[PDB]
Every structure is written in C-alpha cells, then in structure tokens.
UniProtKB/Swiss-Prot annotation:
The organism's taxonomic lineage, starting at the top: Bacteria, Bacillati, Bacillota, Bacilli, Bacillales
Residues of the full protein shown: 89 to 223 of 231
Chain residue ranges for the region called Disordered: 115-135
Organism: Staphylococcus aureus
Binding sites annotated in the UniProt record for Ca(2+): 15, 34-35
Disulfide linkage: none
The protein's name: Nuclease A
Superkingdom in the source lineage: Bacteria
Composition skew (Basic and acidic residues), residue ranges: 115-131
Active site (record annotation): 29, 37, 81
C-alpha cells in the first residue's frame, strides 16, 4: 500500500471527509470504521455523533499534512465515495477514532481489510478502558 497527498476541503461527519485528491474534490468514507452519525433521519444525531464528528474534524483541520491510503480492493463505494485510510501528520484517523472509543470496527469486506487486525486491537483496548461508546 502507499500513501498519497491530499488537501482538506471540509470535514463532514465522523466517518466522512471531503478532500482535494489528484486535483479533484472528493468525498472519502473512512475504511473499516463505523462512527455514530450526526447524519441520517434513519437514526438522526446519535449518541457520541457530535463527539466523533468534532474529533475527526479537529484532527484533520489541525494537520500539517493529510495523506490518503487506498486498500487493495475497490477504491470507491456505490455512492461515489473514496474508500481509504486517512492520515493526519502520520497518524491514522481511522485508528484514532477507534482507539478513543468513538468508532467500532465495521463489517469487513475483503480484500479491503489490510489494517483490520490493527484496528481490532485498538478497539479491544478502548473497550477494556471503557472509553466513550464503551462507557
């Protein structure tokens, strides 16, 4: 896998960021994580939604550089969104949310699962530490 540069346009929710990639504005869906959402009447503004959203937001907005890392499988989902691991100053935002108990690891679709074990290890630790969602 390899990381490529991108530029923040706008943070949208815990699990989506809009980025300028290869000169095109694009919505990215954070791979392998489910964040409580601020979006969708089919739920609404769920519990920890604003928290997961502020975290991702802060993290990408305060970064010196953003990089995207596509996995081995399909790179977009049925809504036209990029499917990636997003890094802020070298830190993976998807792991960070999971490490803080602000996301659970999603149902996984091979072959897009290269960091699954890494993330499951962080989720186990957040649950042990009974953080946020695991409170």
């Amino acid at each position: 896998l390899h990381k490529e540069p991108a530029t923040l346009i706008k943070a949208i929710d815990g699990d989506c960021v809009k980025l300028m990639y290869k000169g095109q504005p694009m919505t990215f869906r954070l791979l392998l994580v489910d964040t409580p959402e601020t979006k969708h009447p089919k739920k609404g503004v769920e519990k920890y939604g604003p928290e997961a959203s502020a975290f991702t937001k802060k993290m990408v907005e305060n970064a010196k550089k953003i990089e995207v890392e596509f996995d081995k499988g399909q790179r977009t989902d049925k809504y036209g969104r990029g499917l990636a691991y997003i890094y802020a100053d070298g830190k993976m935002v998807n792991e960070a949310l999971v490490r803080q108990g602000l996301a659970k690891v999603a149902y996984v679709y091979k072959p897009n699962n290269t960091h699954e074990q890494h993330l499951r290890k962080s989720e186990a630790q957040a649950k042990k530490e009974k953080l946020n969602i695991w409170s």
